[PDB]
Structure of S-methyl-5'-thioadenosine phosphorylase:
Amino acid sequence: KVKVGIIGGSGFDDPNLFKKVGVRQVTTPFGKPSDTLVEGFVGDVACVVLPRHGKGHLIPPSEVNYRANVWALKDLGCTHILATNACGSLQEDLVPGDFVVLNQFMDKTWGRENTFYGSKPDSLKGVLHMPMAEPFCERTRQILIQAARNKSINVYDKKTMDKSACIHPCVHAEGSAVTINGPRFSTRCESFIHKAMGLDIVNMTLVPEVSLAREAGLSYASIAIVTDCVDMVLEQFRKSVVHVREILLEAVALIGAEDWTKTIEANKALVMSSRQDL
Amino acid sequence: KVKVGIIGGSGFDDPNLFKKVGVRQVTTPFGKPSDTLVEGFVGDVACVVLPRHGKGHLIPPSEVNYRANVWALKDLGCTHILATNACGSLQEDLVPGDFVVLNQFMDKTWGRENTFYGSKPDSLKGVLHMPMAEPFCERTRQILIQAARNKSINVYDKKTMDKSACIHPCVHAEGSAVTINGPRFSTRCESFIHKAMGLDIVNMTLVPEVSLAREAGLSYASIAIVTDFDCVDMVLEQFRKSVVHVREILLEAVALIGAEDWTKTIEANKALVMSSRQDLL
Amino acid sequence: SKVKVGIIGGSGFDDPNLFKKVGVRQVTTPFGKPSDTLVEGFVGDVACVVLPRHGKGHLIPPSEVNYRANVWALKDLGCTHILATNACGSLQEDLVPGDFVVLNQFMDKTWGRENTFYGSKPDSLKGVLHMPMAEPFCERTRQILIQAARNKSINVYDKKTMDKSACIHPCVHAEGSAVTINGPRFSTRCESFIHKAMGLDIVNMTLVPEVSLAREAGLSYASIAIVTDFDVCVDMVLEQFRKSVVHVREILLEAVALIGAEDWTKTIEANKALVMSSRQDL
């Protein structure tokens, strides 16, 4: 059966997504997760919620233990991870209040543990070279988008629809993120360069979360929240969180409604075939 | 009220900017600075000098303790930091002997401690996400430029001047730097890519120094010396002359800083830090 | 030994056996242990030393390879040259799986690796070294690799001097640029498109800081890249890569002989001098 883990970013430091059966603390071979995990159900589907930055948002993007977080979710029996990521827009059609179901990224992070495998004592034995050309689980991506349609939230698909048919607030059916290391925001120079490369949004937390999920044999999809006076932004972002929560809840249900036997098996075999030491 | 900190790069390993009234060997929560700090006065203005690489230039750019350097200056009561930086050019209008008052950068460093805040045992508690769109203190930049004018040095501003106004040597009124980690220089491939991105100069020491200064609530401006990394004797003499010019600019700049009131700007700097504390918001 | 050729074997060369072993050296360096034991012997009359970058069982990922120990160990055994192999993915349509590239440029996207012998840390040599890297390889040694290809009847394609219709596969490209990513994951499509738009020819994980450290050590370094396919298709690619390994072996052995056939006194002196002149602490 499926079990859906949820990694909550900003706006989700302490989310009340459902009636919790209980709070759980776990450990992993790679250290402690960001915080304790909230266990519960969405209908008949098991769900686990984990705040990326910890309840008090005391852990910056570069110091988040992504391995521990993803591995904890794996060990709890999760088959899927849905993640939220607060982001800044680099393109005119992506405005604050919009969401993006990412399908691509460019990595500018460093100093973070980005693989479970290696030759150091603090890692699993072996050399894993994972294909990442299309880094997300496509079935899971499409579920997030269908969830938005189901909650009457506008979906904008730039290859199917013309620019004039972009109606805000909307979920962009695709998009690419540049993930910077942080914690500082980009300079104007950097943003112009990132925009020139054709990137859609900038964030700090997508990588290596997405990579580690694939290493763990888990189906992963990310929904980014465009947030780009402070009180107004908070109100807009608060409004966005309501809709993101709606999307996440519907998506968990949608995942539970389908059979994932072949896809899961494919996830696991992809890990096996990427082992270069074997 | 104000106190001007100066971080000396190459050519300033043993600054000697003024008669040292006192020296301070400090220890910060983030380690020891590059060397002892030298205190004194330029006119009536309090000033503190620190060689970024240490007296013997034994410390490479990636191993400089920028946090300790910036914090030590902060702890001494500095309100401003002026920094010098030796660089190579990526564009034809910038030639050896020129200077650049930077207003932008693109960061390609790594493995340096670039923030005071975080969840590590030695971090200040909290998460700080500073805006860096215009990463320098604009008032302090304009002071460097005006200081150059005051010392009869050509100032070139491509935004408002024809290219015929670019008379060498000149201080370029704006410019973007790529900061590479070092210690090696770039390949031709890398240089071509940086040039294509529209970057003006390349250096190894600007980041995270500029970032950490802003986290500290300090006003920071950088003056880059364009030199040649490709006859050695003529280049060295040229760089020697450049060092003299920068010394003059720095001295005039300290004087110009102390002549203005910085109450509002200092308050705004401190506020920006507090407003960027995500753990608090 | 006036000249002695160090060889760093990458994927396909975990357990190389390029010549009869004469001496198996278990060495330590100031920067730690090399990826494996070093195997000394001869190719004809030329002294030669071979070392597997990833160790025998290929257990060491690109980002965890001790490039300093590997280069320094070879320097310590008296090597004057380093020839290195590396597997890579193609970013351009003219470079197909089965081709080889004698690289002349790179763009570095590695991090977290020790990339210099010098510093202020106790784990480094005293001093600050700022090496020029505009053309990061030993040009003479590059031309040896290419001439070696010719001597073994392998197609050589030079884009600068030859027409595009003369690009006959499989072939050795006489020049090329690599982006070196940190790994261990391969690139996203987004990253590959960006790298291609920058004009880069191939992507690898092992070139940097190996090339940089070899120059720091005053050694003549040249690299030959094996273009493979990272996208039963697997059975076919494996077969192609096996043939690539065989041909690169022939190139390396012929290159060693070619190096042994010339004087290197001036070039070696220049390598040593470039190190000394790059000391910013003097």
Q: What stands out?
A: Helices of chain A lie at 66-75, 138-150, 188-196, 209-215, 230-257, 261-273.
